[PDB]
Amino acid sequence: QKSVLEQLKQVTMVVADTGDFELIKKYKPVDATTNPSLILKAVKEQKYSNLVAETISKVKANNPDLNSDDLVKEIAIEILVSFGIKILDVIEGKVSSEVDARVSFNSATTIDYAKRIIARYESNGIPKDRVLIKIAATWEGIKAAKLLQKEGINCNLTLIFDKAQAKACAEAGVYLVSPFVGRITDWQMQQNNLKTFPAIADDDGVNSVKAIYKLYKSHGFKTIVMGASFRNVEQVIALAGCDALTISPVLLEELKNRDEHLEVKLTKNDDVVTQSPQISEADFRWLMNENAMATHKLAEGIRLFTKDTIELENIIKQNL
Numbered sequence: 407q408k409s410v411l412e413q414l415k416q417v418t419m420v421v422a423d424t425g426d427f428e429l430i431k432k433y434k435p436v437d438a439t440t441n442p443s444l445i446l447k448a449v450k451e452q453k454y455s456n457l458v459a460e461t462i463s464k465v466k467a468n469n470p471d472l473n474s475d476d477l478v479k480e481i482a483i484e485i486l487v488s489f490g491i492k493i494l495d496v497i498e499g500k501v502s503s504e505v506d507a508r509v510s511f512n513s514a515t516t517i518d519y520a521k522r523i524i525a526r527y528e529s530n531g532i533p534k535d536r537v538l539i540k541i542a543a544t545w546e547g548i549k550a551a552k553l554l555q556k557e558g559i560n561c562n563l564t565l566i567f568d569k570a571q572a573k574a575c576a577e578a579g580v581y582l583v584s585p586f587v588g589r590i591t592d593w594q595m596q597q598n599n600l601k602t603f604p605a606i607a608d609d610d611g612v613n614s615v616k617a618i619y620k621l622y623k624s625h626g627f628k629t630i631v632m633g634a635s636f637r638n639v640e641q642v643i644a645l646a647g648c649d650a651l652t653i654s655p656v657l658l659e660e661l662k663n664r665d666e667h668l669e670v671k672l673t674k675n676d677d678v679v680t681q682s683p684q685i686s687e688a689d690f691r692w693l694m695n696e697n698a699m700a701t702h703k704l705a706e707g708i709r710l711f712t713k714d715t716i717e718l719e720n721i722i723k724q725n726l
């Protein structure tokens with residue numbers, strides 16, 4: 407009788423994947439995640455037209471001495487944080503905010519951007535424990551997260567497409583990882599012009615998260631495994647029991663409206679813990695290169711998020 411959504415909540419931390427806070431409350435997720443494409447989407451929604459002009463005026467009035475390029479960067483970070491704050495107003499947990507994709511291959515500037523995000527949340531009276539900094543899992547991003555975590559700044563390592571990335575993130579003591587399901591399924595379908603989704607047992611994306619989950623629990627890693635990027639409700643249902651799952655409002659609505667019984671598929675255990683050697687940079691780069699899909703989707707993810715961030719900057723410039 408209970409909805410699949412309410413059942414899932416008892417075995418998995420349910421997280422809402424959106425920048426539109428108005429769609430969140432009705433699903434009562436614990437945490438929420440944003441990314442640069444979701445922020446751009448939100449910014450272009452007519453209902454937020456004013457909130458954007460307001461941010462432009464506030465930042466512009468509080469920084470009369472910034473050169474035009476610095477003003478735009480400042481406005482872009484305040485927008486990202488503004489949407490996160492609106493989200494935090496309607497949930498009890500944390501929100502993920504992603505660093506500018508352009509710093510993805512520079513650990514120092516990733517660290518700087520991460521701290522600027524934390525500084526803006528703090529200036530707005532938000533406790534830092536309510537924020538997760540989202541960072542692309544390139545070697546440089548993982549290296550930055552390692553430093554951030556040592557300084558008490560929790561990170562969400564994203565664009566994870568291979569178990570080696572996952573292992574390196576866990577070895578860096580990252581709070582949470584976001585292995586992708588959907589984009590892997592996208593690649594699988596593109597390869598052979600498949601129209602329909604593959605059966606769940608044959609879904610490369612679902613199997614990737616299952617393999618990473620199993621890797622983590624057998625190695626005793628404490629990093630939270632949060633499946634992300636979904637294309638259909640069956641993919642979410644197939645991962646019931648995962649530490650966490652971030653889901654679009656569209657899929658959350660589907661989970662809320664159906665009431666069949668939910669069977670847990672991923673579970674923890676008391677097996678002897680495997681202690682393996684750490685992954686070196688050279689090992690990491692080699693393994694990523696062997697995975698054609700992973701190298702392509704990580705690269706593409708960074709390119710696409712950059713494109714959306716540039717579009718946001720242009721919207722800012724067109725309204726400055």
Ligand SMILES: *[C@@H](CO)[C@@H](O)[C@H](O)[C@H](O)COP(=O)(O)O
Nearest residue numbers: 423439440441564584588634635
């Ligand atoms: C952050 C990961 O925790 C998320 O917002 C991801 O970027 C999205 O879930 C990716 O979804 P798409 O593949 O549909 O863009």
